[model samples]
Structure formats: C-alpha cells, structure tokens
Target: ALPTVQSPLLSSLPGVKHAFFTRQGGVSKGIYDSLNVGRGSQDEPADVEENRARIARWFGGGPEDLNVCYQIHSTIAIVADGSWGDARPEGDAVVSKTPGVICGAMAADCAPVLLVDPEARIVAAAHAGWRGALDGVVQSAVDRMVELGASPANITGVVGPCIGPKSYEVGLEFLHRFEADCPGSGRFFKPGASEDKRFFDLPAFVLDRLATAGVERREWVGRDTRAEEEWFFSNRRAFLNNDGDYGRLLSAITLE
Candidate 1:
C-alpha cells in the first residue's frame, strides 16, 4: 500500500476522500525510486502511469479517474469532470464536484492544498508554489469552488508537505518581490545566514492564503519535503545536490 497522510477534517466528511501521498510504494527506480506520479518528470512513462494507477486505486477508482493540472504556477483553476483524460489543462489548481473524479496537484517542494466543502460535496486541489501562492492560486480555487455552490464557511483546507522555512533560503530580490507584491508578507520571512538572504515559510504563507481566501478551517500537515528526503521528493533538495531532476508527490481530493 502507498504511504499517505490524511487530513482528519477531510476524512471525517461522509462522502469525501483525500490523500497526501509520499514518495513510496511505486515501481519507478533511480531518483524516482518509487511512487513518482509526475507525468512531466523524466521518469519512465510506464512507471509514472503505474504509480498514478495505484493512487487512483487507493481512492477506489481507476487511473483515468485522476485529474491533475499542467501546473503553470499561475492562478488558473479549472473544473474537472473526468472528461479531459490525458489532455490535462494548463493551470495551477483543479476543482471538481464529480464523484469518483479525483482532483489532484503535483509538487516537489511546492505546497499542495486540498480543500473540501462537505455540505456542498465540492473538492479542490491547488498547486501552491511561492509564485502561485503569491499570485492567488488558493483564492482562485476557492472562487471556483464557490461558483460550484461551495461556501467559504463550509470549506476545510489542508496544506500538504512542502519546503519548510529553515530549508528555503532566498536572496534579497526574492524578499523584495514578496514585499512588493504582497504587503505584510515580510512576516513570513526570517533573516538568513547573510544580509542578502532570507528564509521563507512557504507552508505558512499558503495557510495564510487559505485563510485570506475565506476558508475558515485550515491547517498545515507540518511536513517539510526538503528535510524529509526519505518520504518525499524535493525540487530544492534535488537542485542543491545537483541531482539533475526530481520527482513529484501527489496530493488529491475526491467526492465518493
């Protein structure tokens, strides 16, 4: 069985199912090792397909039931009804009200947010990298869900594993960009080793985005992808080690 983290809020919902899958329990080898479901990665297509199949099966569906975005790090959020198939839309978030259709987000060091409105039976998964979060990916998804009859007051969101504050060091320009783009975002950054550097709290920023988007119940699972290499695939860690490429972890939600 694949290793996954389930949010208690989502799990408690009667007809909702969600999982924050780790990089374990698949057939890929080398850097992919196991459970690398990233179709955009350099891993074998067959292996990636098999890994995704396992994820779908965990939700009691087939591989075709899983729907993920191309992840352009933008605020685009699209509705999924399991009709797109392999032609995934280019976006950062996926929203769906269809049962058995899994809304998924793929990430390595980027946060994956899973949201659900239990009363409305609407589910959403958003890919929240620093750029996407800053650009309003979380809010985009929430807005789309609202269009589908989900209310912010009834929504519960969870931020899955991502690069942690201590593991994410950036330059002055990066800090300046956040400050200029999002006022008061400086609170999420801490001074780094040198004067020109700062450490970012990505998950915290994502959670704040969720809250600001009107989600009343939100939480971070609190796992750091970069620091926990054995259980995750981290783009920052791979880049720092010159590992050529890194795999992606999948976080998904569905109505069943």
Candidate 2:
C-alpha cells in the first residue's frame, strides 16, 4: 500500500475518503522509482496503469472509477459521472457526486487540491499550478461542485504537496504578473536569494483561493515536493537537475 497524507478535516467526514499520495509504493524504476501515476509521463504504460489501479483499490473501487484530468493549467473544471473511462478530459479539475467515482488531480510541482462537501456527497480534485491558481482553478472546481448540490460553506479543501515557498524561487516578472492580475497577492511572495527574484507561496495562494470561493474549511498538508525527494516528485527539482522528465503524484477523493 502507498503512504498517504490525510487531512483531519476531510477524514472526520463520514462517507468521504481522500488521500494525498506520496511517491512511494509502485513498480516504475529510475526517475519514477515508485508510485508514479501520471499516464502522460514517460514511464511505462503498464506501470502507470498498475499504479492508478492501486489508488482506486485503496478507495475500494476499480481503475475506471478514478477520474483525473489532462490538466492544461486552465480554469476549466468538469463534472464526472464515471462515464469517461480512460479518456481524460483536458481540464484542470474534476468534480463528482457519484459514490464510487474518484476525483483525482495529478501533479509534480503543482499543487493538488482535494475538496469535498460531505453533506452534499460531492467531491472535487483540482490541479493548481501557478497559472491555474492565479487564473481561478479552485474557484472553477468549487463552482462545479456547487452546481452538483454542494454548498461552499460545507466544502472542506485540502491542498497537497507542491513546490513550497522557500523552495520556489521565481523571476521578478512572475511576481509582477501575480501582482498585476491578483491585487494584494504580493504578500504571498517573499524576497529570494537575489534582488530580482522572489519565492512564491503556491500552497498559500491556493488555500486563499479556496477561501475566497467560500470554502470555510481549508488546509495545506505542509509538505514541499521540491524539497522532499524521498516522499514526492517535483518538476522544478527535475528541471534543476536536468532529469528531463518527472513523475506526477496523485491526490484524490471519493464518496463512499
């Protein structure tokens, strides 16, 4: 079984099951050493399939029950009804009310947000990279859940591991972009090692977006993907090391 980070808020809710999976426990070797579930990765297709199946089994379902998007760093979020099968939609988030259907988000350095409104029996998983977060991916997910009978007040959002603030140095233009598009977002950026650089607090920004979308309960698992090599995968880390390709971790939720 894979080691997973469970949020206390979501764990306390009956009929809801969720996990922020680590990069441990799988068959892929090399850079994708263990649990790499990203179907779009360079890893073997069979390995990816087995890893995904394991995740679905953990939720007491089959591979067809797990639905993850082909995330394009957009604000797009789609509702799931277990009808898509292996064809992943091109979107940033997936929402579901189906009992055995798992809503999943795949990421390496990008934040994976799992949200659920237990009362409404609705769940959503969003991939929140900087562009997605800045553009409103979380809000898009929440809105889709709301349309499916979830209330923002009843929704509990948990942001999974990604490139943390201290480990995510960016150019001045990156900071400028956030400041220009999202006023008051400057607070999430801290001075980096150089004067023209800043470290972006991605998890914090995603959580704020969840809150602004009316979700009263939200949390970040507090793990840094780029900093913690043994437990997670990181695109930034791969880039810095010239690894060329990186595995993606999966964060998911389902209604029981």
Tens-digit per-residue lDDT, 47-162, candidate 1: 99999999999999988899998889999999997756777789999999999899999998999999999888899999999999999999999999999999998899999999
lDDT of 2 by residue, 29-67 (tens): 999998999889899999999999989889999998989
Relative to the unseen true structure, what is the C-alpha lDDT of residue 8 in candidate 1, on a scale of 0 to 100? 74
**Of the candidates shown, which would achieve the greatest lDDT relative to the real structure?**
1
Each model's lDDT comes to 0.93, 0.92
Clashing pairs in 2: none
Off by over 4 Å in 1: none
The TM-score values for the models, in the order shown, are 0.98, 0.98
- Clash tally for model 1: 0
